[PDB]
Amino acid sequence: MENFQKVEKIGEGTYGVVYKARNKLTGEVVALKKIRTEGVPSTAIREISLLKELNHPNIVKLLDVIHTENKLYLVFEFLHQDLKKFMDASALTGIPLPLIKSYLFQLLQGLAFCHSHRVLHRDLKPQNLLINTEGAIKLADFGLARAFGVPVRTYTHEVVTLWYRAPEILLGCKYYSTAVDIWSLGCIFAEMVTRRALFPGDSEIDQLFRIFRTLGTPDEVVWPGVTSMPDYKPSFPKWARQDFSKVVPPLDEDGRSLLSQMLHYDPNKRISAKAALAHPFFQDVTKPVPHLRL
Ligand SMILES: NC(=O)c1cc([N+](=O)[O-])ccc1NCc1cccnc1
Numbered sequence: 103m104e105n106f107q108k109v110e111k112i113g114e115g116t117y118g119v120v121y122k123a124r125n126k127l128t129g130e131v132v133a134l135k136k137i138r139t140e141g142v143p144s145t146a147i148r149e150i151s152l153l154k155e156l157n158h159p160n161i162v163k164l165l166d167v168i169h170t171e172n173k174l175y176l177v178f179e180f181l182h183q184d185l186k187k188f189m190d191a192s193a194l195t196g197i198p199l200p201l202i203k204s205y206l207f208q209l210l211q212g213l214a215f216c217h218s219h220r221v222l223h224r225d226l227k228p229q230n231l232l233i234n235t236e237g238a239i240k241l242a243d244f245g246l247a248r249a250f251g252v253p254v255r256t257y258t259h260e261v262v263t264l265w266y267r268a269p270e271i272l273l274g275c276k277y278y279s280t281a282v283d284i285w286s287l288g289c290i291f292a293e294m295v296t297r298r299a300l301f302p303g304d305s306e307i308d309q310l311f312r313i314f315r316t317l318g319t320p321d322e323v324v325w326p327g328v329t330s331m332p333d334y335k336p337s338f339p340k341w342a343r344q345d346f347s348k349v350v351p352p353l354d355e356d357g358r359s360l361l362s363q364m365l366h367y368d369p370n371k372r373i374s375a376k377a378a379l380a381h382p383f384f385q386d387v388t389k390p391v392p393h394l395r396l
Pocket of ligand 1: 112113115120122132133134135162178179180181182183184232242
């Protein structure tokens with residue numbers, strides 16, 4: 103607004119437009135998101151306001167929430183790059199395993215924190231994982247989904263990415279659990295390793311069938327209750343499950359084991375962020391510094 107000097111259009115998020123801005127006073131450089139219409143539900147205001155208290159080293163800090171003139175502004179801590187850009191930049195050589203492991207470990211710490219406070223992300227993707235020169239990675243937009251909701255796109259003709267959506271969401275379950283975040287992070291872990299999205303669906307059904315083609319069509323044995331889900335259809339093709347060794351090569355067995363637990367179909371069997379932190383995959387975790395060209 104008037105207390106900030108737009109420094110650049112960081113982009114156009116799923117809620118609204120985002121700008122890099124400098125606080126004319128404090129001199130602080132922040133990310134300002136303009137939230138998309140009229141009146142603005144007070145329920146959301148209280149919700150969003152509660153998130154200002156959700157502070158952790160691996161969670162992008164929500165500095166302020168400003169409600170004015172039918173517009174809602176969220177002021178966030180600023181980070182220079184997102185994981186999607188970093189992955190693209192590292193596409194030729196790949197992100198080194200030690201850095202992939204460091205990032206996964208930090209993201210799990212961030213999820214464990216949010217989940218312990220009953221806060222879900224619901225829409226994790228590389229674009230909302232932010233990184234800095236110190237080797238830190240942080241989760242952005244935690245709790246906004248709950249505080250609000252979801253239309254058809256973002257806010258103005260922009261295709262919602264379904265690549266990281268958990269199967270229970272695709273099958274129409276109305277109640278999401280912390281498990282949806284573990285699923286998304288598993289998909290991201292695989293993408294960092296292979297340098298290709300794991301399940302790049304272009305429609306809700308293509309997304310679901312890409313998952314089924316790789317992990318096998320779920321049934322009552324591996325996922326009790328799945329055949330009673332809202333959008334489950336007995337007519338779904340029945341695909342056999344593939345071997346992880348073929349899914350994320352050349353990841354080692356510690357990595358494949360952890361990924362398999364993050365991608366279990368039954369949300370209740372899916373590993374928690376807390377439990378994942380204890381997985382043998384992290385026995386030799388360290389905190390490397392990435393090569394960032396800003
Ligand atoms: N908090 C942020 O710094 C930030 C916020 C959003 N967003 O949608 O609210 C997107 C990217 C961000 N940083 C990474 C970034 C990406 C591109 C150019 N500059 C910075």
